[PDB]
Amino acid sequence: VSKGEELFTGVVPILVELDGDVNGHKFSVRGEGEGDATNGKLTLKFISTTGKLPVPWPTLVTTLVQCFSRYPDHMKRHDFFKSAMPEGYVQERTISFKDDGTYKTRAEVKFEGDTLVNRIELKGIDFKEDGNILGHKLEYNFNCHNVYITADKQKNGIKANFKIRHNVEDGSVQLADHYQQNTPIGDGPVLLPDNHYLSTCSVLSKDPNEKRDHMVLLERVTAAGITH
């Protein structure tokens, strides 16, 4: 249904680069792996190049490629993300951590050669030094969530909204409200979807041989909410 979708009929290499600043703590993350939109699966490893991160890895998961979502056949006309490829899209978010600070992110997601690249800048402000983020009080795990997508005709793109639930080590939960906008980089028509969601689950792990602060991630993501 889009030319871009043909770039995803196979396993695609991924590169991710993030430069961040949270409360004046600068950090850089670099990642690589592969995505398979036929299965709605991704596998990535991320490392810090700047030493121990100032924030928990789980708080960076959503920022660190929704073009790898599996769209069921009956929903393929609603896949904005692949329709924007290869030229790609700008993905912007605000992430508001309840009772704590906020991240603002801006990313370009596009092909370079055969690789899907996600390059991000992140700025975090107003975090509490004694809170769950700067205090590293979040469990090293991740819940399943629904990402609610709506068309944004005036920007020829989409918006999304969702609430991430981060488990806290004391048994509480830290909510992170996500507000997202995506705009195509290229000038040709894109697929503007009816309202739907991405059902996403993620598993976080470690590489026993990796000495840098790091995160290994496996994600499963499939679109839903529009019946055959």
mmCIF file of N, CA and C in Angstrom, residues 73-170:
data_model
loop_
_atom_site.group_PDB
_atom_site.id
_atom_site.type_symbol
_atom_site.label_atom_id
_atom_site.label_comp_id
_atom_site.label_asym_id
_atom_site.label_seq_id
_atom_site.Cartn_x
_atom_site.Cartn_y
_atom_site.Cartn_z
ATOM 1 N N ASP A 73 -2.454 -7.270 7.868
ATOM 2 C CA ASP A 73 -2.833 -6.988 6.488
ATOM 3 C C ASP A 73 -4.021 -6.049 6.406
ATOM 4 N N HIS A 74 -5.038 -6.275 7.233
ATOM 5 C CA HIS A 74 -6.249 -5.480 7.127
ATOM 6 C C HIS A 74 -6.033 -4.039 7.568
ATOM 7 N N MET A 75 -4.879 -3.724 8.164
ATOM 8 C CA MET A 75 -4.573 -2.385 8.656
ATOM 9 C C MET A 75 -3.460 -1.697 7.906
ATOM 10 N N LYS A 76 -2.934 -2.300 6.859
ATOM 11 C CA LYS A 76 -1.743 -1.734 6.244
ATOM 12 C C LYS A 76 -1.933 -0.325 5.695
ATOM 13 N N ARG A 77 -3.151 0.103 5.355
ATOM 14 C CA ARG A 77 -3.321 1.467 4.869
ATOM 15 C C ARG A 77 -3.164 2.507 5.971
ATOM 16 N N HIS A 78 -2.971 2.091 7.225
ATOM 17 C CA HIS A 78 -2.860 3.001 8.352
ATOM 18 C C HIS A 78 -1.435 3.122 8.861
ATOM 19 N N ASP A 79 -0.447 2.617 8.128
ATOM 20 C CA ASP A 79 0.950 2.628 8.584
ATOM 21 C C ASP A 79 1.656 3.881 8.044
ATOM 22 N N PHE A 80 1.519 4.982 8.784
ATOM 23 C CA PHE A 80 2.195 6.218 8.432
ATOM 24 C C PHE A 80 3.707 6.012 8.392
ATOM 25 N N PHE A 81 4.231 5.307 9.397
ATOM 26 C CA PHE A 81 5.671 5.264 9.633
ATOM 27 C C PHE A 81 6.418 4.719 8.424
ATOM 28 N N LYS A 82 5.967 3.586 7.866
ATOM 29 C CA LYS A 82 6.662 3.031 6.710
ATOM 30 C C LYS A 82 6.402 3.870 5.472
ATOM 31 N N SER A 83 5.226 4.496 5.374
ATOM 32 C CA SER A 83 4.899 5.276 4.183
ATOM 33 C C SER A 83 5.811 6.481 4.021
ATOM 34 N N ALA A 84 6.397 6.958 5.108
ATOM 35 C CA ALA A 84 7.324 8.075 5.085
ATOM 36 C C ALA A 84 8.727 7.672 4.656
ATOM 37 N N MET A 85 9.012 6.405 4.542
ATOM 38 C CA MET A 85 10.346 5.937 4.218
ATOM 39 C C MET A 85 10.552 5.860 2.707
ATOM 40 N N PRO A 86 11.791 6.016 2.212
ATOM 41 C CA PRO A 86 13.032 6.079 2.988
ATOM 42 C C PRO A 86 13.447 7.430 3.530
ATOM 43 N N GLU A 87 12.815 8.518 3.079
ATOM 44 C CA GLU A 87 13.250 9.836 3.513
ATOM 45 C C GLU A 87 13.025 10.053 4.997
ATOM 46 N N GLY A 88 12.001 9.437 5.562
ATOM 47 C CA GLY A 88 11.858 9.335 7.000
ATOM 48 C C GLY A 88 10.909 10.333 7.610
ATOM 49 N N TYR A 89 11.032 10.483 8.941
ATOM 50 C CA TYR A 89 10.180 11.389 9.679
ATOM 51 C C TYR A 89 10.953 11.978 10.855
ATOM 52 N N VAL A 90 10.491 13.129 11.289
ATOM 53 C CA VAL A 90 10.912 13.747 12.547
ATOM 54 C C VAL A 90 9.941 13.269 13.614
ATOM 55 N N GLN A 91 10.468 12.764 14.722
ATOM 56 C CA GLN A 91 9.664 12.337 15.861
ATOM 57 C C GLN A 91 10.021 13.216 17.047
ATOM 58 N N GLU A 92 9.047 13.909 17.596
ATOM 59 C CA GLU A 92 9.240 14.783 18.731
ATOM 60 C C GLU A 92 8.362 14.326 19.871
ATOM 61 N N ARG A 93 8.887 14.409 21.096
ATOM 62 C CA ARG A 93 8.076 14.138 22.271
ATOM 63 C C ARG A 93 8.355 15.113 23.404
ATOM 64 N N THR A 94 7.338 15.242 24.248
ATOM 65 C CA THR A 94 7.505 15.601 25.649
ATOM 66 C C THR A 94 7.167 14.382 26.481
ATOM 67 N N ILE A 95 8.006 14.086 27.462
ATOM 68 C CA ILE A 95 7.747 13.012 28.410
ATOM 69 C C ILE A 95 7.706 13.645 29.787
ATOM 70 N N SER A 96 6.538 13.615 30.433
ATOM 71 C CA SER A 96 6.371 14.222 31.749
ATOM 72 C C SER A 96 6.342 13.129 32.801
ATOM 73 N N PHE A 97 7.355 13.088 33.635
ATOM 74 C CA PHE A 97 7.419 12.130 34.717
ATOM 75 C C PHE A 97 6.603 12.682 35.881
ATOM 76 N N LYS A 98 5.575 11.959 36.284
ATOM 77 C CA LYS A 98 4.664 12.473 37.291
ATOM 78 C C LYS A 98 5.427 12.787 38.564
ATOM 79 N N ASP A 99 5.145 13.963 39.111
ATOM 80 C CA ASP A 99 5.798 14.465 40.319
ATOM 81 C C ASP A 99 7.302 14.657 40.149
ATOM 82 N N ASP A 100 7.777 14.826 38.919
ATOM 83 C CA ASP A 100 9.210 14.938 38.657
ATOM 84 C C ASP A 100 9.387 15.745 37.371
ATOM 85 N N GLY A 101 10.548 15.603 36.740
ATOM 86 C CA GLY A 101 10.923 16.426 35.615
ATOM 87 C C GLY A 101 10.332 15.968 34.296
ATOM 88 N N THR A 102 10.814 16.621 33.235
ATOM 89 C CA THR A 102 10.341 16.379 31.877
ATOM 90 C C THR A 102 11.512 16.193 30.929
ATOM 91 N N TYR A 103 11.332 15.268 29.986
ATOM 92 C CA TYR A 103 12.215 15.173 28.831
ATOM 93 C C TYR A 103 11.538 15.816 27.624
ATOM 94 N N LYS A 104 12.325 16.489 26.800
ATOM 95 C CA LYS A 104 11.934 16.882 25.460
ATOM 96 C C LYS A 104 12.888 16.210 24.496
ATOM 97 N N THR A 105 12.355 15.594 23.446
ATOM 98 C CA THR A 105 13.172 14.864 22.492
ATOM 99 C C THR A 105 12.827 15.264 21.074
ATOM 100 N N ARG A 106 13.847 15.248 20.217
ATOM 101 C CA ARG A 106 13.668 15.476 18.799
ATOM 102 C C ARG A 106 14.561 14.497 18.075
ATOM 103 N N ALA A 107 13.981 13.725 17.160
ATOM 104 C CA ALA A 107 14.708 12.673 16.466
ATOM 105 C C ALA A 107 14.421 12.720 14.975
ATOM 106 N N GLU A 108 15.404 12.322 14.181
ATOM 107 C CA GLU A 108 15.215 12.010 12.771
ATOM 108 C C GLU A 108 15.354 10.514 12.593
ATOM 109 N N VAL A 109 14.371 9.914 11.942
ATOM 110 C CA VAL A 109 14.350 8.486 11.683
ATOM 111 C C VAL A 109 14.286 8.297 10.172
ATOM 112 N N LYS A 110 15.286 7.650 9.581
ATOM 113 C CA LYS A 110 15.355 7.577 8.116
ATOM 114 C C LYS A 110 16.316 6.472 7.719
ATOM 115 N N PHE A 111 16.291 6.088 6.432
ATOM 116 C CA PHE A 111 17.281 5.151 5.941
ATOM 117 C C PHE A 111 18.559 5.864 5.548
ATOM 118 N N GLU A 112 19.680 5.207 5.842
ATOM 119 C CA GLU A 112 20.979 5.547 5.263
ATOM 120 C C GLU A 112 21.523 4.239 4.705
ATOM 121 N N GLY A 113 21.540 4.127 3.385
ATOM 122 C CA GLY A 113 21.830 2.830 2.793
ATOM 123 C C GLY A 113 20.740 1.848 3.168
ATOM 124 N N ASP A 114 21.120 0.665 3.611
ATOM 125 C CA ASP A 114 20.158 -0.337 4.032
ATOM 126 C C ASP A 114 19.821 -0.258 5.501
ATOM 127 N N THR A 115 20.331 0.740 6.217
ATOM 128 C CA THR A 115 20.170 0.829 7.665
ATOM 129 C C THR A 115 19.140 1.878 8.054
ATOM 130 N N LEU A 116 18.279 1.512 8.986
ATOM 131 C CA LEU A 116 17.325 2.437 9.568
ATOM 132 C C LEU A 116 18.020 3.132 10.730
ATOM 133 N N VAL A 117 18.152 4.452 10.649
ATOM 134 C CA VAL A 117 18.915 5.230 11.616
ATOM 135 C C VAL A 117 17.956 6.106 12.410
ATOM 136 N N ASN A 118 18.149 6.147 13.731
ATOM 137 C CA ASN A 118 17.386 6.999 14.640
ATOM 138 C C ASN A 118 18.398 7.876 15.370
ATOM 139 N N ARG A 119 18.408 9.178 15.082
ATOM 140 C CA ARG A 119 19.336 10.123 15.701
ATOM 141 C C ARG A 119 18.525 11.093 16.530
ATOM 142 N N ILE A 120 18.868 11.227 17.808
ATOM 143 C CA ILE A 120 18.024 11.900 18.780
ATOM 144 C C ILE A 120 18.833 12.905 19.595
ATOM 145 N N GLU A 121 18.201 14.039 19.899
ATOM 146 C CA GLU A 121 18.630 14.938 20.957
ATOM 147 C C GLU A 121 17.589 14.917 22.072
ATOM 148 N N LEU A 122 18.056 14.849 23.316
ATOM 149 C CA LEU A 122 17.171 14.817 24.480
ATOM 150 C C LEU A 122 17.610 15.874 25.481
ATOM 151 N N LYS A 123 16.657 16.641 25.991
ATOM 152 C CA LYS A 123 16.922 17.613 27.047
ATOM 153 C C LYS A 123 15.948 17.341 28.183
ATOM 154 N N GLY A 124 16.456 17.150 29.382
ATOM 155 C CA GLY A 124 15.630 16.918 30.563
ATOM 156 C C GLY A 124 15.851 18.023 31.574
ATOM 157 N N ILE A 125 14.753 18.517 32.144
ATOM 158 C CA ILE A 125 14.815 19.600 33.102
ATOM 159 C C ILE A 125 13.882 19.309 34.267
ATOM 160 N N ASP A 126 14.168 19.985 35.375
ATOM 161 C CA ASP A 126 13.296 20.025 36.541
ATOM 162 C C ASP A 126 13.245 18.708 37.278
ATOM 163 N N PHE A 127 14.236 17.846 37.106
ATOM 164 C CA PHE A 127 14.236 16.620 37.859
ATOM 165 C C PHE A 127 14.675 16.836 39.292
ATOM 166 N N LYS A 128 14.115 16.025 40.164
ATOM 167 C CA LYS A 128 14.459 16.036 41.580
ATOM 168 C C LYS A 128 15.663 15.145 41.814
ATOM 169 N N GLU A 129 16.685 15.702 42.470
ATOM 170 C CA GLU A 129 17.869 14.906 42.762
ATOM 171 C C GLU A 129 17.542 13.731 43.659
ATOM 172 N N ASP A 130 16.484 13.860 44.449
ATOM 173 C CA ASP A 130 16.028 12.837 45.360
ATOM 174 C C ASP A 130 14.893 12.013 44.776
ATOM 175 N N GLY A 131 14.554 12.200 43.500
ATOM 176 C CA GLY A 131 13.466 11.459 42.901
ATOM 177 C C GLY A 131 13.901 10.144 42.274
ATOM 178 N N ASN A 132 12.934 9.489 41.632
ATOM 179 C CA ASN A 132 13.144 8.136 41.149
ATOM 180 C C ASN A 132 14.073 8.070 39.944
ATOM 181 N N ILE A 133 14.225 9.167 39.214
ATOM 182 C CA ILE A 133 14.992 9.186 37.976
ATOM 183 C C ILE A 133 16.446 9.476 38.332
ATOM 184 N N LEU A 134 16.745 10.676 38.835
ATOM 185 C CA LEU A 134 18.137 10.978 39.179
ATOM 186 C C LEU A 134 18.640 10.114 40.331
ATOM 187 N N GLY A 135 17.739 9.608 41.160
ATOM 188 C CA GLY A 135 18.107 8.718 42.239
ATOM 189 C C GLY A 135 18.236 7.265 41.868
ATOM 190 N N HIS A 136 17.980 6.898 40.608
ATOM 191 C CA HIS A 136 18.122 5.520 40.137
ATOM 192 C C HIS A 136 17.343 4.539 41.013
ATOM 193 N N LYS A 137 16.045 4.802 41.137
ATOM 194 C CA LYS A 137 15.156 3.987 41.956
ATOM 195 C C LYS A 137 14.205 3.143 41.131
ATOM 196 N N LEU A 138 14.387 3.097 39.819
ATOM 197 C CA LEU A 138 13.516 2.329 38.949
ATOM 198 C C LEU A 138 14.066 0.933 38.742
ATOM 199 N N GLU A 139 13.178 -0.039 38.723
ATOM 200 C CA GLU A 139 13.564 -1.407 38.407
ATOM 201 C C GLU A 139 14.038 -1.503 36.963
ATOM 202 N N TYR A 140 14.928 -2.458 36.714
ATOM 203 C CA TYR A 140 15.446 -2.680 35.363
ATOM 204 C C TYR A 140 14.529 -3.657 34.634
ATOM 205 N N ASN A 141 13.382 -3.141 34.191
ATOM 206 C CA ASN A 141 12.382 -3.929 33.492
ATOM 207 C C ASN A 141 11.445 -2.955 32.796
ATOM 208 N N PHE A 142 10.459 -3.499 32.090
ATOM 209 C CA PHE A 142 9.600 -2.666 31.264
ATOM 210 C C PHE A 142 8.268 -3.372 31.063
ATOM 211 N N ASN A 143 7.197 -2.621 31.136
ATOM 212 C CA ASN A 143 5.839 -3.125 30.985
ATOM 213 C C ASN A 143 5.366 -3.027 29.542
ATOM 214 N N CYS A 144 4.249 -3.676 29.253
ATOM 215 C CA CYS A 144 3.571 -3.524 27.975
ATOM 216 C C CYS A 144 2.654 -2.301 28.015
ATOM 217 N N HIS A 145 2.536 -1.609 26.877
ATOM 218 C CA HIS A 145 1.711 -0.419 26.787
ATOM 219 C C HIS A 145 1.033 -0.337 25.433
ATOM 220 N N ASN A 146 -0.043 0.427 25.378
ATOM 221 C CA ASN A 146 -0.668 0.798 24.126
ATOM 222 C C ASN A 146 -0.297 2.233 23.773
ATOM 223 N N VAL A 147 0.118 2.445 22.518
ATOM 224 C CA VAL A 147 0.467 3.756 21.968
ATOM 225 C C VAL A 147 -0.683 4.199 21.079
ATOM 226 N N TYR A 148 -1.419 5.241 21.464
ATOM 227 C CA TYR A 148 -2.633 5.646 20.761
ATOM 228 C C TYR A 148 -2.251 6.677 19.701
ATOM 229 N N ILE A 149 -2.570 6.380 18.443
ATOM 230 C CA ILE A 149 -2.196 7.183 17.284
ATOM 231 C C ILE A 149 -3.420 7.836 16.666
ATOM 232 N N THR A 150 -3.253 9.095 16.273
ATOM 233 C CA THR A 150 -4.268 9.832 15.540
ATOM 234 C C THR A 150 -3.595 10.614 14.425
ATOM 235 N N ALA A 151 -4.336 10.854 13.343
ATOM 236 C CA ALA A 151 -3.823 11.642 12.233
ATOM 237 C C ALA A 151 -3.714 13.112 12.603
ATOM 238 N N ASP A 152 -2.718 13.776 12.007
ATOM 239 C CA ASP A 152 -2.509 15.223 12.131
ATOM 240 C C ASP A 152 -2.422 15.780 10.705
ATOM 241 N N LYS A 153 -3.581 16.056 10.107
ATOM 242 C CA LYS A 153 -3.627 16.441 8.697
ATOM 243 C C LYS A 153 -2.822 17.707 8.420
ATOM 244 N N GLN A 154 -2.856 18.669 9.333
ATOM 245 C CA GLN A 154 -2.212 19.948 9.057
ATOM 246 C C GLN A 154 -0.696 19.811 8.984
ATOM 247 N N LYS A 155 -0.119 18.826 9.664
ATOM 248 C CA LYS A 155 1.306 18.549 9.558
ATOM 249 C C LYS A 155 1.609 17.379 8.634
ATOM 250 N N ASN A 156 0.587 16.832 7.962
ATOM 251 C CA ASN A 156 0.759 15.676 7.094
ATOM 252 C C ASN A 156 1.427 14.529 7.849
ATOM 253 N N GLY A 157 1.045 14.352 9.113
ATOM 254 C CA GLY A 157 1.656 13.344 9.961
ATOM 255 C C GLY A 157 0.694 12.792 10.971
ATOM 256 N N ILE A 158 1.237 12.453 12.150
ATOM 257 C CA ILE A 158 0.468 11.826 13.210
ATOM 258 C C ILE A 158 0.852 12.427 14.550
ATOM 259 N N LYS A 159 -0.041 12.220 15.505
ATOM 260 C CA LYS A 159 0.230 12.434 16.916
ATOM 261 C C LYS A 159 0.036 11.119 17.653
ATOM 262 N N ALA A 160 0.683 10.983 18.806
ATOM 263 C CA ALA A 160 0.437 9.834 19.651
ATOM 264 C C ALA A 160 0.463 10.271 21.100
ATOM 265 N N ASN A 161 -0.230 9.492 21.919
ATOM 266 C CA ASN A 161 -0.328 9.726 23.342
ATOM 267 C C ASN A 161 -0.323 8.387 24.054
ATOM 268 N N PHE A 162 0.349 8.306 25.192
ATOM 269 C CA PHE A 162 0.368 7.073 25.974
ATOM 270 C C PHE A 162 0.983 7.386 27.322
ATOM 271 N N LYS A 163 0.795 6.472 28.257
ATOM 272 C CA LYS A 163 1.308 6.613 29.612
ATOM 273 C C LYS A 163 2.179 5.410 29.930
ATOM 274 N N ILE A 164 3.456 5.624 30.109
ATOM 275 C CA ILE A 164 4.367 4.548 30.465
ATOM 276 C C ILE A 164 4.335 4.374 31.974
ATOM 277 N N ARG A 165 4.364 3.114 32.390
ATOM 278 C CA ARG A 165 4.347 2.712 33.795
ATOM 279 C C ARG A 165 5.719 2.149 34.126
ATOM 280 N N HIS A 166 6.510 2.874 34.906
ATOM 281 C CA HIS A 166 7.814 2.385 35.313
ATOM 282 C C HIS A 166 7.719 1.820 36.734
ATOM 283 N N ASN A 167 8.067 0.560 36.913
ATOM 284 C CA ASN A 167 8.105 -0.006 38.260
ATOM 285 C C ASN A 167 9.230 0.615 39.063
ATOM 286 N N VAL A 168 8.906 1.005 40.305
ATOM 287 C CA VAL A 168 9.862 1.560 41.253
ATOM 288 C C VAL A 168 10.279 0.451 42.213
ATOM 289 N N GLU A 169 11.512 0.523 42.693
ATOM 290 C CA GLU A 169 12.069 -0.573 43.485
ATOM 291 C C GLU A 169 11.327 -0.815 44.790
ATOM 292 N N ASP A 170 10.638 0.192 45.317
ATOM 293 C CA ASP A 170 9.881 0.032 46.558
ATOM 294 C C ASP A 170 8.497 -0.544 46.333
#
